[PDB]
Amino acid sequence: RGEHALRRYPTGEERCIACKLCEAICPAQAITIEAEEREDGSRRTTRYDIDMTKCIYCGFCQEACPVDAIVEGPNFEFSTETREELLYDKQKLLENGDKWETEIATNLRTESLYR
Amino acid sequence: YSSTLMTADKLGPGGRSSVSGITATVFGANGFLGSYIVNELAKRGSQVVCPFRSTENEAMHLKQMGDLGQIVLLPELDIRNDDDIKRAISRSNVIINCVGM
Amino acid sequence: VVPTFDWKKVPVPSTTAKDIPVTVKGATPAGDLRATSGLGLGDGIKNHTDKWLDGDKKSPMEYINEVAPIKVKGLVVASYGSDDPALGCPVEYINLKGTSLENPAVCKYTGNRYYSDDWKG
Amino acid sequence: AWRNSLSKSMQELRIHLCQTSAGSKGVRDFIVANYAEMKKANPHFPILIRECAGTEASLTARYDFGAEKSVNVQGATTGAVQQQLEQLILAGQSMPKSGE
Amino acid sequence: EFATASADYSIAMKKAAEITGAAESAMGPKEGGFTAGVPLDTFTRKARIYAPARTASQSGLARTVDFATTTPAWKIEFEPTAKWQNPLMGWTSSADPLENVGRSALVFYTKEEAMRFCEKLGWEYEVTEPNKRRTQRTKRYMQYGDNFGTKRAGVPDLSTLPSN
Amino acid sequence: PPSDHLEVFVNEQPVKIPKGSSVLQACDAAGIDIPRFCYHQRLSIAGNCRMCLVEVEKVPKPVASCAMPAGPGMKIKTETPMVKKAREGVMEFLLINHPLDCPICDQGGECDLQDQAMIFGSDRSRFVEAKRAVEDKNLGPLVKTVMTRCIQCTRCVRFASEVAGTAELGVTGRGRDSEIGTYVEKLMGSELSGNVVDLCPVGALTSKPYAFTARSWELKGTESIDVSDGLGANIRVDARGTEVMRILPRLNEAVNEEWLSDKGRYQYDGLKHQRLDKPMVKGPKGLQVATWQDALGAAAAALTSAAPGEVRGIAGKLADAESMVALMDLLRGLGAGDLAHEGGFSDMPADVRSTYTANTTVQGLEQSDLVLLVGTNPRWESPVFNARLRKMFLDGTQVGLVGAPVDLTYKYEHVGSDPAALAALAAGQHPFLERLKKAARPAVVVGPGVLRRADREAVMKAVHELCGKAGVVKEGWNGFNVIHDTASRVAALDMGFGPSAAARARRAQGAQPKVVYLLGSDDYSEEDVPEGAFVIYQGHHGDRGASRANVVLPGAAYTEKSGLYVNFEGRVQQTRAAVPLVGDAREDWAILRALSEVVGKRLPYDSHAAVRARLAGIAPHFANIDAVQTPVWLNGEYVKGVEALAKAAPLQPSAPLTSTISNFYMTDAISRASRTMAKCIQARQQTK
Numbered sequence A: 001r002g003e004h005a006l007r008r009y010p011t012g013e014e015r016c017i018a019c020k021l022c023e024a025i026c027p028a029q030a031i032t033i034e035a036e037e038r039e040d041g042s043r044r045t046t047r048y049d050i051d052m053t054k055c056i057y058c059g060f061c062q063e064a065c066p067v068d069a070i071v072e073g074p075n076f077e078f079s080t081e082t083r084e085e086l087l088y089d090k091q092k093l094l095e096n097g098d099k100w101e102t103e104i105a106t107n108l109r110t111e112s113l114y115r
Numbered sequence B: 001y002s003s004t005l006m007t008a009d010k011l012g013p014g015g016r017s018s019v020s021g022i023t024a025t026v027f028g029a030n031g032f033l034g035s036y037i038v039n040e041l042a043k044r045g046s047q048v049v050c051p052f053r054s055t056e057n058e059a060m061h062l063k064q065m066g067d068l069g070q071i072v073l074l075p076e077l078d079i080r081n082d083d084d085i086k087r088a089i090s091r092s093n094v095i096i097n098c099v100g101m
Numbered sequence C: 001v002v003p004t005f006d007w008k009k010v011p012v013p014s015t016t017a018k019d020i021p022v023t024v025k026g027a028t029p030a031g032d033l034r035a036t037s038g039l040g041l042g043d044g045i046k047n048h049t050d051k052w053l054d055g056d057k058k059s060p061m062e063y064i065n066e067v068a069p070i071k072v073k074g075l076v077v078a079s080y081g082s083d084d085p086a087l088g089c090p091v092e093y094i095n096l097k098g099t100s101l102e103n104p105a106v107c108k109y110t111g112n113r114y115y116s117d118d119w120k121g
Numbered sequence D: 001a002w003r004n005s006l007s008k009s010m011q012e013l014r015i016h017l018c019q020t021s022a023g024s025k026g027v028r029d030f031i032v033a034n035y036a037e038m039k040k041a042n043p044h045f046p047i048l049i050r051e052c053a054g055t056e057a058s059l060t061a062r063y064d065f066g067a068e069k070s071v072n073v074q075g076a077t078t079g080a081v082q083q084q085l086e087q088l089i090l091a092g093q094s095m096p097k098s099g100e
Numbered sequence E: 001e002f003a004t005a006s007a008d009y010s011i012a013m014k015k016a017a018e019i020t021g022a023a024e025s026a027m028g029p030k031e032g033g034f035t036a037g038v039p040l041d042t043f044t045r046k047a048r049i050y051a052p053a054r055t056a057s058q059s060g061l062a063r064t065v066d067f068a069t070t071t072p073a074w075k076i077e078f079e080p081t082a083k084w085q086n087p088l089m090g091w092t093s094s095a096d097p098l099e100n101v102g103r104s105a106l107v108f109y110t111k112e113e114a115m116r117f118c119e120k121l122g123w124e125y126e127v128t129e130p131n132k133r134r135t136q137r138t139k140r141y142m143q144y145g146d147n148f149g150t151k152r153a154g155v156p157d158l159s160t161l162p163s164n
Numbered sequence F: 001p002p003s004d005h006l007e008v009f010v011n012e013q014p015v016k017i018p019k020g021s022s023v024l025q026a027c028d029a030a031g032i033d034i035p036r037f038c039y040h041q042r043l044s045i046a047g048n049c050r051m052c053l054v055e056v057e058k059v060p061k062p063v064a065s066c067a068m069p070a071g072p073g074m075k076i077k078t079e080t081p082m083v084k085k086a087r088e089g090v091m092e093f094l095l096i097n098h099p100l101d102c103p104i105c106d107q108g109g110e111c112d113l114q115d116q117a118m119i120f121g122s123d124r125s126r127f128v129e130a131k132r133a134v135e136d137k138n139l140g141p142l143v144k145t146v147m148t149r150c151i152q153c154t155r156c157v158r159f160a161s162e163v164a165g166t167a168e169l170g171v172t173g174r175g176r177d178s179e180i181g182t183y184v185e186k187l188m189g190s191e192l193s194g195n196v197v198d199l200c201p202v203g204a205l206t207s208k209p210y211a212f213t214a215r216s217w218e219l220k221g222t223e224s225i226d227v228s229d230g231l232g233a234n235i236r237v238d239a240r241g242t243e244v245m246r247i248l249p250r251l252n253e254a255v256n257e258e259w260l261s262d263k264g265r266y267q268y269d270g271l272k273h274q275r276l277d278k279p280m281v282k283g284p285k286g287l288q289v290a291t292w293q294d295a296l297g298a299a300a301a302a303l304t305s306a307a308p309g310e311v312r313g314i315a316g317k318l319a320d321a322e323s324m325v326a327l328m329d330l331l332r333g334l335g336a337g338d339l340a341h342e343g344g345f346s347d348m349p350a351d352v353r354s355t356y357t358a359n360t361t362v363q364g365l366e367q368s369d370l371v372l373l374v375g376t377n378p379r380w381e382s383p384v385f386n387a388r389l390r391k392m393f394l395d396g397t398q399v400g401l402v403g404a405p406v407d408l409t410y411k412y413e414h415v416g417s418d419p420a421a422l423a424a425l426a427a428g429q430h431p432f433l434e435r436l437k438k439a440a441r442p443a444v445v446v447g448p449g450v451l452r453r454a455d456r457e458a459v460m461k462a463v464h465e466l467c468g469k470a471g472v473v474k475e476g477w478n479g480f481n482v483i484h485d486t487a488s489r490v491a492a493l494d495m496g497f498g499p500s501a502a503a504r505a506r507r508a509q510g511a512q513p514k515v516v517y518l519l520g521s522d523d524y525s526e527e528d529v530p531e532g533a534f535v536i537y538q539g540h541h542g543d544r545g546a547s548r549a550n551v552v553l554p555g556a557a558y559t560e561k562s563g564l565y566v567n568f569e570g571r572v573q574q575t576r577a578a579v580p581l582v583g584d585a586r587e588d589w590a591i592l593r594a595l596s597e598v599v600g601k602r603l604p605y606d607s608h609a610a611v612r613a614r615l616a617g618i619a620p621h622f623a624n625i626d627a628v629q630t631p632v633w634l635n636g637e638y639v640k641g642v643e644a645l646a647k648a649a650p651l652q653p654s655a656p657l658t659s660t661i662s663n664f665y666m667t668d669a670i671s672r673a674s675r676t677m678a679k680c681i682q683a684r685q686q687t688k
Ligand SMILES: NC(=O)C1=CN([C@@H]2O[C@H](COP(=O)(O)OP(=O)(O)OC[C@H]3O[C@@H](n4cnc5c(N)ncnc54)[C@H](OP(=O)(O)O)[C@@H]3O)[C@@H](O)[C@H]2O)C=CC1
Pocket: B027, B028, B029, B030, B031, B032, B033, B034, B052, B053, B054, B077, B079, B098, B099, B100, B101
């Protein structure tokens, strides 16, 4: 359970559908979500924040997600010099997922036999 | 302009998490008087921009003085360069000069 | 008796009428009411994607619009979003009758589009 | 006649009563026997009859500049509340005037 | 016979509330706030004692005053104070210490229990009695057999029959 | 009575119930809450979901408790093995074709199907076949359909037939392919069309403006009142921080039962646009932001430099009683008397409360067997009140109307259209008078469009003569009712917010004010606000009244304050703050108390309780919240008292008795700023 990340389908569409289950289960209340409907009618988020200085790195959000959108990736080396660099918004989490997608998929090909 | 500076954007009762509406640039903020002025502005919920010439170790005490995002630190200030002065005041409605010798 | 009401003579303020959030074709009729919340109103942002994406970066909506609809034989299709059903979405059963390449049916989980030439047409 | 005088001394008259209480009987009799004649003399004078369950019978005169006086009339007869309205009329002459 | 939720630990909670000597504890007005040790300006605020109505979205009645003896349903609520947005992230900020304490933690079986708590703590209170549900249906569609009655269009006239 | 309450046994407990009650009502009187999907209290019984199945002794099958009547000495069992097996089986049948849609569904968190599956159902499924897939339907801009989630309870069909009256939905097809909707593409045109979203127990019908924005567990709910009309429907406001997310009705059988019109439900998005959040003073550059001290000083300077006869104060449609009594006392303390109301008939006499309120009350009107409407359109003035009128129609109450013919969703007899027809009815020329004379409890409802007329006194005299001849008001029954369409009018009539005789004379000879105070007024006439006058606007939306003002003082909306409002039956109700004040706005009575201090004559009250006590000192019924007095009836003495107003401004027997509401979806500044109301109008314009 490392740095949180947001994932896509192979087409390039976001997996997240703003169900707010990960926000409800979070014991630290480290997630803040706002949503409305997109211009094509889809149900998508407009804000998805994770306070990494409030997070406890439990993985409960990863368990609660029904579409495998939020994960905790294999990155542990993400120390910064300012605390404002650790208040992640939606764009940075998507950038993390776009960085770590192949490793996350390799990990999930094994861990889907157990979960 | 008159008293719209202190009233128009004032949000919250006035603590560390509140908003006063002041964006200020303090020149010579790491000095003796400038540090107290920066503490006085930031504790009421104002954004304070602090350019400095010295090393970061001598300016680290200004980082504590305000909430997240409200203390802005700009190292390698050269006051013979107008670009640094232009960047440091580009969002401020208050400028305070404590530079002396 | 009971005269008809003329709705076309009802005045609407021009500031309100020009600011109605509507939809492109997608999963609705084009031009129906789009639900919005208050986020972004202080910054003057009326668009969904601009509220969280900054720059000329390729949006997710522009990614899914480049994938063509998929021809499926039958009347109902099951959508998982993956080859492996454990790795995708909960299964969505999408109606395919009355659908064509021009007016396909869209998955509410994935945004993939499907149509069938099996409903006597 | 006191009824014609009841547009110059005061700006408004407010009557408070209970609908069923024994103490508001004389006030109700006064209103029933005198509202039409007090309104016929001046058709534009506001006479606010207001009722609530279990309240105290009271008369209130509003003068100019927002001034107000009150007299408690609970347990009074029709002649008695007539009298109290008449001293409400009398105090209206010694009030400052407005409008001009 | 007596059976009013007679199969759970709530039997052992109704008694232990009526133990002698402890069932008659009483304090003077505002006295419990003096010994509470919280700042005294907190008791200058106003409180509301009320039982919240059923949500319109659902049909169940469990969180209502229908099950008042089974479940505590009366609440204490306070007026809102100022909120604003965080400049860096946009999160909702507040300075209210009583922002969620009445809605999360304080529940009472009756109206008078919540009044007693407010009186001994020093809060000034207003009490709102909930609106009573009506169970009697309309005259039309009173029973299922009134869907098919003669009240739809009257008794049928037998004047279009053959031989009239 | 021959034992009008019969005794049944529910789980061996004796229960007394009224006669004609079902098994489900007997279970409810025993403290048991039977699961249900198709039963509703306000609809007719259907009996098709099979979830309410209980066991009755000497019956080998489970009975449907919603439909089965309760007999004497009946023994009901609700916790035997066959009842639990029945509940699990019916739930399993309900879930085999349902889509796995809970993450994307808006009912998730407040779903009857989810919670009943958790409690009365099993934890597994054994179904691995393909499901039924259904295309979605278009029903307009307010109702969103995902029809794969339909469970065929037919609550929507019964609602549209019985309460809304439009009867436009049906079930097409047969068997597994049964399908709810309209066969052709149609728009749901009822004003009460948002209530069916509440009535649907699943996420088949959800609210389109609300869609995908929030979950129900995040919302802080506040019980408030509705101010979009004069009925004052009881509502619940759900907010997330500073933002109101939705508005829902709540139960009040004396006011609104369980309904709410689409304007009162969907106008909340106008609270996010054109909001006044700062004080402004007009300078040479124009209106610009100023401090509260500067704005109060400018308003006080203009209010004091003018003569007292050149000051006018106009109350808006949404002003609470505290701000209105504050403005009234402040203007009267300066020696002014020119008070006006944006809702019209400002010179109407307010001496007896029975002459401008509904004496029968809203729930007491159901005991009337014949109803005569005079010059009103109740479908556009109060659609919830019109729904209760349709409910009265469905169980036998006959309706007649004197006025312009309108669609009311029930059949009525058009007696006439003008006051000439009213006089002919009073004389005896129309046979509807004999129908009124033989009625046990006749009722007359007079709308606000009659009171807005210049000859309203003669029309009210004719109505009083008709009520005297037809026995409308007698011993034991008072059937005379006057309704309103604005939230603030009855409180202003209660407190005496009316112009003085000198001010009425000065308006008659054409005097023009120089200072105008606009207490939330944006629909003022041009005769009342002259050009070149000094305008002080106090309000919450930037509109017609704020674009013209010199001093703008930002106040609170009805979702941000707790003010008193009185509906047209005389019931004192109150709002509650669901969100805090926006920006640098203030409480509305507090602005006037501060302004009275800056002028130089302080108001004698410094708190919300003290201004409410001042209101109770003027009229004592203000102190009794959520209740209505029985008003005094003075027979024909009141009509005899105002005969001078009948002789002057004589009757106009040719002008039709009409309703003044020409735009139902946009009636005030909040609904004019709502984009949802504009889409609602555009949907009715693009259908032609
Ligand atoms: N009692 C007093 O101290 C009095 C002070 N004043 C005036 O008020 C101000 C207070 O200064 P004070 O804090 O008291 O003493 P300081 O010397 O501590 O203030 C010096 C500040 O000016 C900065 N500075 C000096 N020269 C330069 C330069 N060439 N380029 C960039 N930054 C520079 C220093 O930065 P670095 O740390 O990198 O040098 C430091 O931040 C001065 O103007 C002083 O003359 C007035 C009356 C009396």
